[PDB]
């Protein structure tokens, strides 16, 4: 049967499912659309066999997970759609509610790390679905990216780049999910798994190859012009070697304890 | 926004899923599965803007559907999937046996569901199929036929939905051993089966097809719902 696969419905891995689609690759699945938060937690429950899985999850399920190599959802400065929107200065919150999208679960706690090491604040948060009207706030995905080109910019909002407030602080990339395979299933299906994860790699390589095409083609759909479109898609990075794992690393050890996970947890990752 | 297509998840469609996948269509498509009936009702109720519609329902409800030209699920002699081993995923299929098995019973209708009661289509009669006998081949051995046509509910974006279907259809003809290889990884058909069954089936909807269209529903017209001379509408 079929690997039940997720896919994060979000605009940074459309460029992904246009090369999934374009090398026919779709047909080998039972695709499930849905956001971060809700495909971690269905892989963890094993209602998925393959998918991406936000990094605080994934390390607080390790021991059950096994993470494919060389493809991830990362980047190395900007990230463009994990932003904090804010309208008093980040110092400035020490006391101040601070909402946190409900689909995040790896940007929230890093956006938690900042704001608590970088600009010395302890928020009062609370945890609500992504709206920026309704609701300074942690945004990731799509609501995120619309608050840092459009909303923000239209009312004067400040809008932070997660990304960039990392490594402007320790100079290293991030990587906020890895796609993994529930540790049982790859050792059930050996070979299906591999296969999932070579065809993952060739898709994403025509989703880079073909950048241009699926930024027109969305275009067409989303409030997001063309050039935002194809900018944000270059600016996402999907590598997953030694330079992102070191990030993860450091991240897992700074975050580790108050988190759910060892400050060494160790990430498996899917062998040859 | 995107348009609301439905698709039949039967496998006489996988073929051309692999099309409007291959070619990018289908980041263009708000795209709904579902069997034949289903697709044929939600279309006419308004929760679908453009997809397959079964024969019989698109001619009862000519006066408000659109039909793509050059496209649509037909055969030319044997069909494989509708035959008679009334399954209540179609309404077309059922009708024909009903022409032959007539002209060459007591019916009731349930689920196409094998292993109780039998007329069937898609997966279940190609399942079934491998005494089993073939609606396409019995039309042929009495009289093409097309079982499903594809239309949008009576601008711009129809018309490019239209060509991206043809686009996707033409493409799924010149890699149609691709799709086998890849669909025998999971179906219970061998290799050859699945090849052999999508190049039997006949996609084409020109002049050739619009006539077997004609001749259906003269045939079935009064006593099924619909003037025997009804005008199937083609996209301009």
């Known amino acids: 049967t079929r690997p039940r696969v997720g896919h994060i419905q979000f605009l940074n891995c459309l460029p992904l499912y246009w090369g999934l689609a374009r090398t026919g690759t779709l047909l080998d699945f039972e695709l499930t659309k849905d956001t971060p938060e809700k495909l971690s937690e269905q892989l963890v ?3 998925l066999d393959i998918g991406p899985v936000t990094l605080v999850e994934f390390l607080k399920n390790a021991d059950d997970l096994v993470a494919f190599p060389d493809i991830a959802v990362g980047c190395d400065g ?5 932003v904090i929107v804010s309208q008093v200065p980040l110092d400035r919150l020490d006391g101040a509610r601070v909402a946190l999208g409900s689909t995040s679960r790896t940007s929230v706690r890093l956006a938690q790390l900042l704001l608590s090491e970088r600009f010395g604040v302890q928020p009062d948060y609370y ?4 709206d920026l009207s309704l609701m300074a706030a ?3 995905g799509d609501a995120a990216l619309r608050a840092n080109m459009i909303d923000g910019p239209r009312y004067g909002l400040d809008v932070h780049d997660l990304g960039a407030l990392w490594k402007e602080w320790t100079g290293l990339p991030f990587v906020f999910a890895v796609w993994a395979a529930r540790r049982d299933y790859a050792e059930r299906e050996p070979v299906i798994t591999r ?19 699926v930024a027109e083609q969305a275009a067409r759909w ?5 050039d935002t479109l194809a900018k944000y898609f270059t600016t996402l990075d999907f590598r997953f070697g030694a330079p992102q794992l070191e990030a ?12 759910g996970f060892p400050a060494d947890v160790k990430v498996e990752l899917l062998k040859p």
């Open 127 to 130: 945890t609500c679905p992504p």
């Open 222 to 226: 989303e409030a997001f012009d063309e």
């Open 248 to 259: 993860v690393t450091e991240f897992a050890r700074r975050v580790g304890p108050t988190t």
């Open 78 to 82: 900007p990230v463009m759609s994990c």
């Open 45 to 47: 429950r094993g209602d």
């Open 195 to 213: 296969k999932v994860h070579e065809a993952f790699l060739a898709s994403r390589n025509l989703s880079l190859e073909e950048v241009e095409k």
């Open 138 to 140: 942690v945004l990731i």
